[PDB]
Coordinates of C-alpha atoms (C1' of nucleotides) and ligand atoms in Angstrom, one line a residue:
Chain H
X9 CA 0.0 0.0 0.0
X10 CA 2.6 2.6 1.1
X11 CA 4.6 -0.2 -0.6
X12 CA 2.5 0.0 -3.8
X13 CA 3.1 3.8 -3.8
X14 CA 6.9 3.1 -3.4
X15 CA 6.8 0.5 -6.1
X16 CA 5.0 3.0 -8.5
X17 CA 8.2 5.2 -8.5
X18 CA 10.2 2.0 -9.2
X19 CA 11.3 0.3 -12.3
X20 CA 11.2 -3.5 -12.2
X21 CA 14.1 -5.1 -14.1
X22 CA 14.3 -8.9 -14.4
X23 CA 17.5 -10.8 -13.6
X24 CA 18.1 -14.6 -14.1
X25 CA 19.8 -16.9 -11.5
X26 CA 23.5 -16.3 -11.2
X27 CA 23.2 -12.6 -12.1
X28 CA 25.6 -10.4 -10.1
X29 CA 23.0 -7.6 -9.6
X30 CA 25.5 -5.3 -7.6
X31 CA 29.3 -5.5 -7.4
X32 CA 31.6 -4.3 -4.6
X33 CA 33.8 -1.3 -5.5
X34 CA 31.4 0.7 -7.9
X35 CA 29.5 3.7 -6.6
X36 CA 26.0 3.5 -5.1
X37 CA 23.2 5.4 -6.7
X38 CA 20.3 2.9 -6.7
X39 CA 18.3 1.4 -3.8
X40 CA 17.0 -2.0 -4.9
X41 CA 13.8 -3.7 -3.5
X42 CA 13.2 -7.4 -4.2
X43 CA 9.8 -7.8 -5.7
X44 CA 10.5 -11.5 -6.4
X45 CA 13.4 -14.0 -6.0
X46 CA 16.3 -14.6 -3.5
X47 CA 19.7 -13.1 -3.6
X48 CA 23.1 -13.8 -1.9
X49 CA 25.4 -11.1 -0.5
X50 CA 29.2 -11.9 -0.8
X51 CA 32.6 -10.6 0.1
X52 CA 35.7 -12.1 -1.5
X53 CA 39.1 -12.8 0.0
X54 CA 42.0 -10.6 -0.8
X55 CA 43.0 -12.9 -3.6
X56 CA 40.6 -15.9 -3.3
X57 CA 37.3 -17.6 -2.2
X58 CA 34.3 -15.7 -1.2
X59 CA 32.1 -15.9 1.9
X60 CA 28.4 -15.5 1.8
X61 CA 27.2 -12.8 4.3
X62 CA 23.5 -13.5 4.0
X63 CA 20.6 -14.4 1.7
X64 CA 18.0 -11.6 1.2
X65 CA 14.6 -12.6 -0.1
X66 CA 11.6 -10.8 -1.5
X67 CA 10.7 -8.0 0.7
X68 CA 14.3 -6.9 1.4
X69 CA 16.0 -3.8 0.1
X70 CA 19.5 -4.1 -1.3
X71 CA 22.0 -1.3 -1.9
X72 CA 20.9 1.0 1.0
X73 CA 24.3 1.3 2.7
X74 CA 25.0 4.0 0.2
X75 CA 21.7 5.9 0.6
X76 CA 22.8 7.9 3.6
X77 CA 26.1 9.5 2.4
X78 CA 27.2 10.8 -1.0
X79 CA 30.0 9.1 -2.9
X80 CA 29.6 5.8 -1.3
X81 CA 30.9 2.6 -2.8
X82 CA 29.1 -0.7 -2.9
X83 CA 30.3 -2.9 0.0
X84 CA 29.7 -6.4 -1.3
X85 CA 28.5 -8.4 -4.3
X86 CA 24.9 -9.5 -4.6
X87 CA 24.4 -12.5 -6.9
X88 CA 20.9 -14.0 -7.8
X89 CA 20.1 -17.4 -6.3
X90 CA 17.0 -17.6 -8.3
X91 CA 15.5 -15.4 -11.0
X92 CA 14.5 -12.1 -9.5
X93 CA 12.4 -9.0 -10.3
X94 CA 14.2 -6.0 -8.8
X95 CA 12.3 -2.8 -8.3
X96 CA 14.7 0.1 -8.3
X97 CA 14.4 3.8 -7.5
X98 CA 17.4 6.1 -7.4
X99 CA 18.6 7.5 -4.0
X100 CA 17.6 11.1 -5.0
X101 CA 14.1 9.9 -5.7
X102 CA 14.1 7.8 -2.5
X103 CA 14.9 11.0 -0.5
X104 CA 11.9 12.9 -2.0
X105 CA 9.8 9.8 -1.2
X106 CA 11.2 9.8 2.4
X107 CA 9.8 13.3 3.0
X108 CA 6.5 12.3 1.4
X109 CA 6.2 9.2 3.5
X110 CA 8.4 8.2 6.5
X111 CA 7.1 4.7 6.6
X112 CA 9.5 3.4 3.8
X113 CA 12.4 4.9 5.8
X114 CA 11.0 3.0 8.9
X115 CA 10.6 -0.4 7.2
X116 CA 14.1 0.0 5.6
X117 CA 15.6 0.9 9.0
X118 CA 14.0 -2.1 10.5
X119 CA 15.8 -4.1 7.9
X120 CA 19.1 -2.4 8.6
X121 CA 18.6 -3.2 12.4
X122 CA 18.1 -7.0 11.6
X123 CA 21.1 -7.4 9.3
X124 CA 23.3 -5.7 12.0
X125 CA 21.8 -8.0 14.6
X126 CA 22.5 -11.2 12.6
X127 CA 25.9 -10.1 11.4
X128 CA 26.9 -9.4 15.1
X129 CA 25.8 -13.0 15.7
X130 CA 28.1 -14.1 12.8
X131 CA 31.1 -12.3 14.3
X132 CA 30.2 -14.2 17.5
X133 CA 29.9 -17.6 15.8
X134 CA 33.1 -17.1 13.8
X135 CA 34.8 -16.4 17.1
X136 CA 33.3 -18.8 19.6
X137 CA 32.2 -21.8 17.7
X138 CA 34.1 -24.5 16.0
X139 CA 33.3 -25.5 12.3
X140 CA 31.1 -28.4 13.4
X141 CA 29.0 -26.0 15.5
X142 CA 28.9 -23.5 12.8
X143 CA 27.6 -26.1 10.3
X144 CA 25.0 -27.1 12.9
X145 CA 23.8 -23.5 13.4
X146 CA 23.7 -23.1 9.6
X147 CA 21.5 -26.2 8.8
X148 CA 19.3 -25.1 11.7
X149 CA 19.0 -21.7 10.2
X150 CA 18.7 -23.0 6.6
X151 CA 15.7 -25.1 7.7
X152 CA 14.3 -21.8 8.9
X153 CA 15.4 -19.8 5.7
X154 CA 12.1 -19.6 3.7
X155 CA 12.7 -22.3 1.0
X156 CA 13.1 -25.5 2.8
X157 CA 10.4 -28.1 1.8
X158 CA 8.7 -29.7 4.6
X159 CA 9.8 -33.2 5.3
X160 CA 7.4 -35.4 7.4
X161 CA 10.0 -36.0 9.9
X162 CA 12.4 -33.1 9.2
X163 CA 13.0 -30.1 7.0
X164 CA 14.7 -30.4 3.6
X165 CA 17.0 -27.9 2.1
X166 CA 18.8 -28.1 -1.2
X167 CA 22.4 -26.9 -0.5
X168 CA 25.8 -27.8 -1.7
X169 CA 28.8 -28.5 0.6
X170 CA 30.5 -25.7 -1.2
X171 CA 27.7 -23.2 -0.2
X172 CA 27.8 -24.4 3.4
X173 CA 31.6 -24.0 3.4
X174 CA 31.2 -20.4 2.1
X175 CA 28.7 -19.6 4.8
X176 CA 30.8 -21.2 7.5
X177 CA 34.3 -20.5 6.6
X178 CA 35.9 -23.9 5.7
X179 CA 36.7 -26.3 2.7
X180 CA 33.9 -28.1 0.9
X181 CA 35.6 -31.3 1.9
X182 CA 35.7 -30.1 5.6
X183 CA 32.0 -29.6 5.3
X184 CA 31.8 -33.1 3.8
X185 CA 33.7 -34.7 6.7
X186 CA 31.3 -33.1 9.2
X187 CA 28.1 -33.8 7.3
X188 CA 29.3 -37.5 7.3
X189 CA 29.6 -37.3 11.1
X190 CA 26.2 -35.7 11.6
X191 CA 24.6 -38.4 9.3
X192 CA 26.2 -41.2 11.4
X193 CA 24.7 -39.6 14.5
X194 CA 21.2 -39.8 12.9
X195 CA 20.8 -36.0 13.0
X196 CA 21.2 -35.3 9.3
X197 CA 20.3 -37.1 6.1
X198 CA 21.8 -35.9 2.7
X199 CA 22.3 -36.4 -1.0
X200 CA 22.7 -32.9 -2.6
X201 CA 19.4 -32.3 -0.6
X202 CA 20.0 -32.5 3.2
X203 CA 17.3 -33.1 5.8
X204 CA 17.9 -31.4 9.1
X205 CA 15.8 -33.9 11.1
Chain F
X9 CA 20.3 21.2 15.3
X10 CA 17.4 18.7 15.3
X11 CA 19.7 17.3 17.9
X12 CA 18.9 19.7 20.8
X13 CA 15.2 19.5 20.2
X14 CA 15.7 15.7 20.6
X15 CA 17.9 15.9 23.7
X16 CA 15.6 18.1 25.6
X17 CA 13.4 15.1 26.2
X18 CA 15.9 12.7 27.4
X19 CA 17.0 12.1 31.0
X20 CA 20.7 12.7 30.9
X21 CA 22.5 10.3 33.3
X22 CA 26.2 9.9 34.1
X23 CA 27.9 6.5 34.1
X24 CA 31.3 5.8 35.8
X25 CA 34.1 3.9 34.1
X26 CA 33.3 0.1 33.9
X27 CA 29.6 0.6 34.7
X28 CA 27.5 -1.7 32.7
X29 CA 24.7 0.1 31.1
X30 CA 23.1 -2.5 28.8
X31 CA 23.3 -6.2 29.7
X32 CA 22.7 -8.3 26.6
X33 CA 19.4 -10.2 27.1
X34 CA 17.7 -7.2 28.9
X35 CA 14.4 -6.2 27.2
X36 CA 14.9 -3.2 25.0
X37 CA 12.8 -0.2 25.9
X38 CA 15.1 2.7 26.0
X39 CA 17.3 4.3 23.3
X40 CA 20.5 6.1 24.6
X41 CA 22.6 8.9 23.0
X42 CA 26.3 9.3 24.1
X43 CA 26.7 12.9 25.1
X44 CA 30.2 12.5 26.4
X45 CA 32.5 9.5 26.8
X46 CA 33.4 6.2 25.3
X47 CA 31.8 2.8 25.5
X48 CA 32.7 -0.8 24.3
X49 CA 30.1 -3.0 22.7
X50 CA 30.9 -6.6 23.5
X51 CA 29.4 -10.2 23.4
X52 CA 30.5 -13.1 25.5
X53 CA 30.2 -16.9 25.1
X54 CA 28.4 -19.0 27.8
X55 CA 31.8 -20.5 28.7
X56 CA 33.2 -16.9 29.4
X57 CA 35.2 -15.7 26.4
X58 CA 34.3 -12.2 25.2
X59 CA 34.8 -10.3 22.0
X60 CA 34.6 -6.5 21.4
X61 CA 32.3 -5.8 18.5
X62 CA 33.2 -2.0 18.6
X63 CA 34.0 1.0 20.6
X64 CA 31.3 3.6 20.2
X65 CA 32.3 7.2 21.2
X66 CA 30.3 10.4 21.9
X67 CA 27.7 11.4 19.4
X68 CA 26.6 7.8 18.8
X69 CA 23.3 6.3 19.6
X70 CA 23.4 3.2 21.8
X71 CA 20.4 0.8 21.9
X72 CA 18.9 1.5 18.4
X73 CA 18.3 -2.1 17.4
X74 CA 15.1 -2.6 19.5
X75 CA 13.4 0.6 18.2
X76 CA 12.0 -1.1 15.2
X77 CA 10.5 -4.4 16.5
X78 CA 8.3 -4.8 19.5
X79 CA 9.7 -7.0 22.3
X80 CA 13.4 -7.6 21.5
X81 CA 16.3 -8.4 23.8
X82 CA 19.4 -6.2 23.9
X83 CA 21.9 -7.7 21.4
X84 CA 25.2 -7.1 23.2
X85 CA 26.7 -5.6 26.4
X86 CA 27.6 -2.0 26.3
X87 CA 30.1 -1.2 29.2
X88 CA 31.3 2.3 29.8
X89 CA 35.0 2.5 28.9
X90 CA 35.1 5.9 30.5
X91 CA 32.8 8.4 32.3
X92 CA 29.8 8.7 30.0
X93 CA 27.2 11.4 30.0
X94 CA 24.4 9.3 28.3
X95 CA 21.0 10.6 27.3
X96 CA 18.0 8.3 27.7
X97 CA 14.5 8.3 25.8
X98 CA 11.6 5.9 26.0
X99 CA 11.3 4.0 22.8
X100 CA 7.6 4.9 22.6
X101 CA 8.4 8.5 22.9
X102 CA 11.3 8.4 20.3
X103 CA 8.7 7.0 18.0
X104 CA 6.8 10.2 18.5
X105 CA 9.8 12.4 17.8
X106 CA 10.3 10.7 14.4
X107 CA 6.7 11.7 13.3
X108 CA 7.5 15.1 14.5
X109 CA 10.9 15.3 12.6
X110 CA 12.4 12.5 10.4
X111 CA 16.0 14.0 10.5
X112 CA 16.8 12.2 13.8
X113 CA 15.6 8.9 12.3
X114 CA 17.9 9.7 9.4
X115 CA 21.0 10.6 11.6
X116 CA 20.3 7.3 13.4
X117 CA 19.8 5.0 10.4
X118 CA 23.0 6.5 9.0
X119 CA 24.8 5.3 12.1
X120 CA 23.4 1.8 11.8
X121 CA 24.4 1.8 8.1
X122 CA 28.0 2.5 8.8
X123 CA 27.8 -0.1 11.5
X124 CA 26.5 -2.7 9.0
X125 CA 29.5 -1.7 6.9
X126 CA 32.1 -2.2 9.6
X127 CA 30.6 -5.4 11.1
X128 CA 30.6 -7.1 7.7
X129 CA 34.2 -6.2 7.4
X130 CA 35.0 -7.8 10.9
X131 CA 33.3 -10.9 9.7
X132 CA 35.6 -10.8 6.6
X133 CA 38.8 -10.5 8.7
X134 CA 37.9 -13.4 11.0
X135 CA 37.1 -15.6 8.0
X136 CA 39.9 -14.6 5.8
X137 CA 42.9 -13.2 7.6
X138 CA 45.1 -15.0 10.1
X139 CA 45.8 -13.4 13.5
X140 CA 48.9 -11.6 12.4
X141 CA 46.9 -9.9 9.7
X142 CA 44.0 -9.3 12.0
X143 CA 46.2 -7.7 14.8
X144 CA 47.9 -5.8 12.0
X145 CA 44.6 -4.2 10.7
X146 CA 43.8 -3.6 14.4
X147 CA 46.9 -1.7 15.3
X148 CA 46.3 0.3 12.2
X149 CA 42.7 1.2 12.9
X150 CA 43.2 2.0 16.5
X151 CA 45.8 4.5 15.3
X152 CA 43.0 6.4 13.5
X153 CA 40.5 6.2 16.5
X154 CA 40.0 9.5 18.3
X155 CA 42.4 9.2 21.2
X156 CA 45.4 8.2 19.3
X157 CA 48.0 10.5 20.5
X158 CA 50.8 11.3 18.0
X159 CA 54.3 10.2 19.0
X160 CA 56.4 12.6 16.9
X161 CA 56.6 10.3 13.9
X162 CA 54.1 7.6 14.3
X163 CA 50.9 7.2 16.1
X164 CA 50.7 6.3 19.7
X165 CA 47.8 4.3 21.1
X166 CA 47.6 2.9 24.7
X167 CA 45.9 -0.6 24.6
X168 CA 46.8 -3.7 26.6
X169 CA 47.6 -7.0 25.0
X170 CA 44.3 -8.1 26.7
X171 CA 42.2 -5.7 24.6
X172 CA 43.7 -6.4 21.3
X173 CA 43.2 -10.1 22.2
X174 CA 39.5 -9.3 22.6
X175 CA 39.4 -7.4 19.3
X176 CA 41.2 -9.9 17.2
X177 CA 40.1 -13.2 18.7
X178 CA 43.2 -14.9 20.0
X179 CA 44.9 -15.2 23.5
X180 CA 46.8 -12.3 25.2
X181 CA 49.7 -14.7 25.0
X182 CA 49.5 -15.0 21.2
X183 CA 48.9 -11.3 20.9
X184 CA 52.2 -10.8 22.7
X185 CA 53.9 -13.5 20.6
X186 CA 53.0 -11.7 17.4
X187 CA 53.5 -8.0 18.6
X188 CA 57.2 -8.9 19.1
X189 CA 57.2 -10.5 15.6
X190 CA 55.9 -7.1 14.4
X191 CA 58.7 -5.4 16.5
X192 CA 61.5 -7.6 14.9
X193 CA 59.9 -6.6 11.6
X194 CA 60.2 -2.9 12.6
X195 CA 56.5 -2.1 12.3
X196 CA 55.4 -1.9 15.9
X197 CA 57.4 -0.3 18.8
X198 CA 55.9 -1.5 22.2
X199 CA 56.1 -1.2 26.0
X200 CA 52.4 -1.1 27.5
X201 CA 51.4 1.6 24.9
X202 CA 52.2 1.0 21.2
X203 CA 53.5 3.3 18.6
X204 CA 52.2 2.1 15.3
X205 CA 54.6 3.4 12.6
Chain W
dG1 C1' 11.5 -35.2 -18.8
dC2 C1' 15.3 -36.5 -22.0
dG3 C1' 20.8 -37.0 -22.1
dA4 C1' 25.3 -34.5 -22.9
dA5 C1' 28.0 -31.1 -20.5
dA6 C1' 28.6 -29.2 -16.6
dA7 C1' 29.1 -28.9 -11.5
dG8 C1' 30.1 -30.9 -7.1
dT9 C1' 32.2 -34.3 -4.5
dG10 C1' 35.2 -38.2 -1.5
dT11 C1' 39.1 -39.8 -0.8
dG12 C1' 43.9 -40.1 2.5
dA13 C1' 48.3 -38.3 3.5
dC14 C1' 49.8 -34.1 4.9
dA15 C1' 51.1 -29.7 7.1
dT16 C1' 50.2 -26.1 10.2
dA17 C1' 48.6 -21.7 12.9
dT18 C1' 46.9 -20.3 17.7
Chain D
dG1 C1' 45.1 -22.2 22.1
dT2 C1' 46.6 -23.9 26.6
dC3 C1' 48.7 -24.2 31.6
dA4 C1' 50.9 -21.9 36.5
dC5 C1' 54.0 -18.9 37.9
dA6 C1' 56.7 -15.3 39.1
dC7 C1' 57.8 -11.3 36.5
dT8 C1' 57.0 -6.7 34.9
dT9 C1' 54.4 -3.0 34.2
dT10 C1' 50.5 0.9 35.5
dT11 C1' 47.9 2.5 38.3
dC12 C1' 46.6 6.1 42.4
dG13 C1' 46.3 7.2 47.4
Chain N
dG1 C1' 56.6 12.4 42.3
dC2 C1' 56.8 8.4 46.2
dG3 C1' 55.6 4.0 46.8
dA4 C1' 52.5 -0.3 47.6
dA5 C1' 48.5 -2.9 45.4
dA6 C1' 46.4 -3.8 41.1
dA7 C1' 46.7 -4.8 36.7
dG8 C1' 49.1 -6.6 32.9
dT9 C1' 52.4 -10.1 31.3
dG10 C1' 56.3 -13.9 29.0
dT11 C1' 57.5 -17.9 29.3
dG12 C1' 57.7 -22.8 27.3
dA13 C1' 56.3 -27.0 26.4
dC14 C1' 52.3 -28.2 24.9
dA15 C1' 47.4 -30.1 22.3
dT16 C1' 44.6 -29.5 18.4
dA17 C1' 41.3 -28.5 14.4
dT18 C1' 40.7 -27.5 9.6
Chain U
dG1 C1' 42.7 -26.7 5.9
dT2 C1' 45.8 -28.9 1.3
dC3 C1' 46.3 -31.4 -3.3
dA4 C1' 44.4 -33.7 -7.5
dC5 C1' 41.4 -36.9 -10.0
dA6 C1' 38.0 -40.3 -10.5
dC7 C1' 33.4 -40.5 -9.6
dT8 C1' 28.5 -38.9 -8.9
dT9 C1' 25.1 -35.8 -9.2
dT10 C1' 22.8 -31.8 -11.1
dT11 C1' 22.1 -28.4 -14.8
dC12 C1' 19.9 -26.8 -19.0
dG13 C1' 19.2 -26.9 -24.2
Ligands
CMP301 N1 26.2 -7.9 6.5 C1 25.2 -7.7 5.6 N2 24.0 -8.3 5.8 C2 23.1 -8.1 4.9 N3 23.0 -7.4 3.8 C3 24.2 -6.8 3.6 C4 25.3 -6.9 4.5 N4 26.4 -6.1 4.0 C5 25.9 -5.6 2.9 N5 24.6 -5.9 2.6 C6 23.7 -5.6 1.5 O1 24.4 -5.8 0.2 C7 24.7 -4.5 -0.3 C8 26.1 -4.4 -0.9 O2 26.4 -3.1 -1.2 P1 25.5 -1.8 -0.7 O3 26.5 -0.9 0.0 O4 24.9 -1.3 -1.9 O5 24.4 -2.2 0.3 C9 24.6 -3.5 0.8 C10 23.4 -4.1 1.5 O6 22.3 -3.8 0.7
CMP302 N1 28.0 -4.6 15.5 C1 27.7 -3.6 16.4 N2 28.4 -2.5 16.3 C2 28.1 -1.5 17.2 N3 27.2 -1.5 18.1 C3 26.5 -2.7 18.2 C4 26.7 -3.8 17.4 N4 25.9 -4.8 17.7 C5 25.2 -4.3 18.7 N5 25.5 -3.0 19.0 C6 25.0 -2.1 20.0 O1 24.8 -2.7 21.3 C7 23.4 -2.6 21.6 C8 22.8 -3.7 22.4 O2 21.4 -3.4 22.6 P1 20.5 -3.1 21.4 O3 20.3 -4.4 20.6 O4 19.3 -2.4 21.9 O5 21.4 -2.1 20.5 C9 22.7 -2.5 20.3 C10 23.6 -1.6 19.5 O6 23.4 -0.2 20.0

DNA sequence: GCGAAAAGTGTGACATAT
DNA sequence: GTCACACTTTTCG
DNA sequence: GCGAAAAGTGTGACATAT
DNA sequence: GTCACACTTTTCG
């Protein structure tokens, strides 16, 4: 509703899966809102693998870290998980629309507050938990991340050892090793699709 | 500014060094604004180890992350590093001030945005950089934080091996072990306080 | 809902940073 | 990373 | 700006997780 | 955590 008004100033572009919709290092001018799809925010090692900072789904804004100060660079990469419809407005336009109705600025700040909250958790987990525990937290969370199919006894997620590695911070084969251990303990069942039972 | 209008309906309180303002887990109901002094935002593991998420200094809001969603716990501990003159507003009342003037909700959300920006970076260092690199980036950044004294040529910061330990995520012992490595390498000069070249 | 081309994976011996 | 310990440093009354 | 208690520390041989 | 390669599994035209 306030959303529809917002969306009316926006221009929906379509992006297929694997699209890198934002890239770290360019300048920020556009605030993006996910009409449809799921996206993955990433940062890349100083000459190497990348780590996934979070999945953002329909209803999230992307880009915003620029919005508040001029000449701001994009902080991370945002690649499409799935095919997405991205409603954009520019920042200038967003500012006018701020003054016209504060409620987008509120729902966006709410989003900002959550990302900080969960990323503070991620600093915590990177510092206090061992890889096994990180992989446990992650399957727990992924069964909660809105795209796990119900499993009569369990929740089923499609995920690759490589993706879990990139979330966690360890080799795809390290992930492998541990997923084998959690299967032997009758906690997890897997084959490209894993069930967090 | 907008600032003074805000502050007039805040109960200004004074915290001594080491006083714990926020305990993580408390119910969020009050936003704070640091009028004078410095605070450290930290999280601890159930078996005792604690990590500093950031030092917040005057001019920063403390306790923002509950303002947006009804009934949340405080996300981290905020302990006063120094004598702090801290302003306090009821959440319900701050809500009112936003409707009355959006520029404070703007100044605030800006602060949370820069915070999302630095906390994603701290996730990045933990995941990507070994302790030497992490302590390196630390000595560097501390030498830009407002309290770094100059030491003719070079910066001078006073920070115990303890603290850096809590910033980087390794034992005070290891912090020592590597600071000397950085002394042999001619980059750090140390004796209780450090002069980062 | 095919089937070729692509993508993800397990293995075991090893070092190695905190 | 850990351990215990005496050792060095800094704090301030 | 003196000194005594508090706060910080280095050692060294070590175990271990990814 | 590493290396590589054979194998298995998923993608997509
Ligand atoms: N830690 C994070 N958690 C969630 N989203 C993030 C995080 N860091 C960056 N982003 C989002 O990804 C975007 C990357 O560049 P921007 O600065 O445009 O704005 C960023 C946010 O929209
Ligand atoms: N990553 C962070 N950087 C800075 N401050 C933080 C961070 N995480 C939490 N905080 C602050 O610590 C406060 C804890 O309580 P709140 O969740 O109300 O609000 C939180 C923020 O003000």
